[PDB]
């Protein structure tokens, strides 16, 4: 089938900057999937906003094909307030699939170290290098 | 050389692009072109921000959690005004169009009641249909005599979902309509979603904004001192009066009409074709401001034909009382009546007595 990267580009909101490249989008989706296996993830606007307000640190991934736009139009400047890097991807179905849920989600906040279990700590250690290189490539934009 | 030559090309006055109540101003028949403008008042689009908000309406997209009264109270809290209101009430689960009137615009709430409403509704059918088109036929069984008109937009039998547009008074009749569609189809059906696409004069395509827009515009004005966004989201109350027939008033008679006088022939400036006796009309100035909603006490041929009479009576006064100066009593017949009252040819109230000369009994007709 057609990939959701090329499919959802007409639906991308005008303020969806920075937008990930296809290789970067694949790396972000893989990192989100590994973090969801680590359970080091916040899904949806409510959880992401609450975690940002408490002071959690990580990476924010925002879907681009969001209608209406007032669902997510406060997230990027709120991430800038708390010094958290963010990046936009064009598809919310892919974000939900990588975020270990059946239905699509709007925004994902990877917070490393958010799981109390030791198995979650080991999974954090194994996806840590991918998370670090993704964050460096996002901040390089 | 570059000099504007005589009879050169230039823009001609096209009143079709004039805003709001000033649109098609050339269609109005002219009672008189001789008048003195008073440098008072403003255009409805050019009011200062206090008068613009105090005379403003908001076409709003209501969310699916709250009711209309709660949204109106929220808008009053956000804009920090004295009064807010609305005419068409939406149920909580319904989204769509809602007209919110602010302060002086709340005077027009009662008048716009009873206007037509248009909804777009999704009906969920409990079972699949043997024939799809029968649903449309079923809709034609329910349309008319109360649903005035309806149109089936789409119907997916695999999803068992049908979206259709209809015109009706309320949304509880939409629940009832979906239940009767289910019963006459025989499979049974209920309402999935409902949305009002038109409430009264305004629709969803006529500058609908959201509650986030209202909050952001108030925030921008408070913290940035920028009024453009607040002026964009808020429309004048004259937008609600475009359907009415218009009568244009001289500036000397505006304040007298605002206090409660009956508007008369010397005050009339322009009038519209098709004005019939006892029809509801709108009294406007030359700047397009709405003075009042009135009742036409004379017809169009009468307005063309008579030299004296009562033109209209104020049903609901819209304009503030002291926006225009008091210029009544300064006319020729008015000063003559004052002189007769002072000099004993009329009593203290102005009625005819024995000292009144017979020529005043002939030429003057008391409209009181």
């Amino acid at each position: 089938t057609v990939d959701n990267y090329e499919a959802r580009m007409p639906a991308v909101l005008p303020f969806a900057k920075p937008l990930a490249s296809k290789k970067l989008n694949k790396k972000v989706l893989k990192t989100v999937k590994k973090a969801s296996k680590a359970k080091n993830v916040k899904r949806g606007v409510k959880e992401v906003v609450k975690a940002l307000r408490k002071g959690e640190k990580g990476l924010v991934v925002i879907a681009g094909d969001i209608s209406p736009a007032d669902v997510i139009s406060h997230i990027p400047v709120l991430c800038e307030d708390h010094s958290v890097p963010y990046i936009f991807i064009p598809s919310k179905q892919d974000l939900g699939a990588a975020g270990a849920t059946k239905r699509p989600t709007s925004v994902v906040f990877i917070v490393p170290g958010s799981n109390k279990k030791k198995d979650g700590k080991n999974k954090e250690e194994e996806y840590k290098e991918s998370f670090n290189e993704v964050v460096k490539e996002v901040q390089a934009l | 050389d570059f000099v504007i030559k005589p009879e050169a090309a230039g823009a001609s006055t096209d009143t079709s692009e004039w805003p709001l109540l000033l649109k098609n101003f050339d269609k109005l028949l002219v009672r008189s072109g001789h008048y003195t403008p008073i440098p008072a008042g403003s255009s409805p689009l050019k009011r200062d921000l206090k008068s613009y908000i105090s005379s403003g309406v908001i076409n709003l997209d209501k969310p699916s959690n709250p009711s209309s009264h709660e949204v109106v109270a929220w808008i009053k809290r956000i804009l920090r005004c004295e009064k807010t209101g609305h005419s068409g009430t939406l149920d909580p689960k319904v989204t769509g169009c809602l007209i919110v009137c602010i302060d002086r615009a709340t005077r027009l709430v009662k008048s716009q009641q009873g206007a037509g409403k248009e909804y777009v509704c999704i009906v969920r059918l409990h079972d699949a249909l043997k024939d799809e088109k029968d649903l449309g036929r079923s809709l034609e069984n329910l349309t008319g005599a109360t649903i005035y008109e309806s149109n089936l937009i789409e119907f997916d039998n695999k999803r068992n979902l049908g979206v259709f547009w209809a015109s009706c008074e309320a949304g509880t009749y939409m629940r009832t309509l979906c239940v009767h569609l289910g019963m006459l189809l025989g499979v049974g059906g209920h309402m999935q979603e409902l949305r009002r696409v038109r409430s009264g004069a305004l629709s969803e395509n006529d500058n609908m904004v959201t509650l986030h827009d209202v909050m952001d515009a108030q925030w921008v004005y408070d913290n940035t001192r920028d009024e453009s966004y607040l002026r964009s989201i808020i429309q004048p109350l004259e937008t609600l009066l475009v359907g009415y027939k218009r009568i244009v008033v001289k500036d000397s008679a505006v304040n007298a009409v605002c206090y409660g006088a009956k508007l008369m022939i010397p005050g009339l400036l322009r009038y519209e074709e098709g004005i019939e006796l006892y029809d509801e009309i709108v009294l406007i100035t030359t700047k397009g401001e709405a003075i009042a909603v009135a009742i036409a006490q004379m017809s169009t041929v009468d307005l063309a034909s008579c030299d004296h009479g009562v033109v209209a009576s104020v049903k609901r006064c819209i304009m503030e009382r002291d926006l225009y100066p008091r210029r009544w009593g300064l006319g020729p017949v008015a000063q003559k009546k004052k002189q007769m009252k002072a000099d004993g040819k009329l009593d203290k109230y102005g009625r005819v007595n024995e000292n009144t000369p017979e020529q005043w009994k002939k030429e003057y007709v008391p409209l009181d």
Partner: protein, 58 residues
């Protein structure tokens, strides 16, 4: 939700149940976003829309 819409040539809404039309344009959700009167993010929304000229009247 199920109610979707597109914009016609005149700019008015065309209502569909489809996520993607026959022409291939992705449809938009008709219902507005959830609002709370105690919302505290007008600054963030205004800043983001002002970075891209999306503020009405700008």
């Amino acid at each position: 939700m199920h109610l979707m819409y597109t914009l016609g040539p005149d700019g008015k809404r065309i209502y569909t149940l489809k996520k993607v039309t026959e022409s291939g344009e992705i449809t938009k959700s008709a219902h507005p976003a959830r609002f709370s009167p105690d919302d505290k993010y007008s600054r963030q929304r205004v800043t983001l829309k002002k970075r891209f000229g999306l503020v009405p009247g700008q």
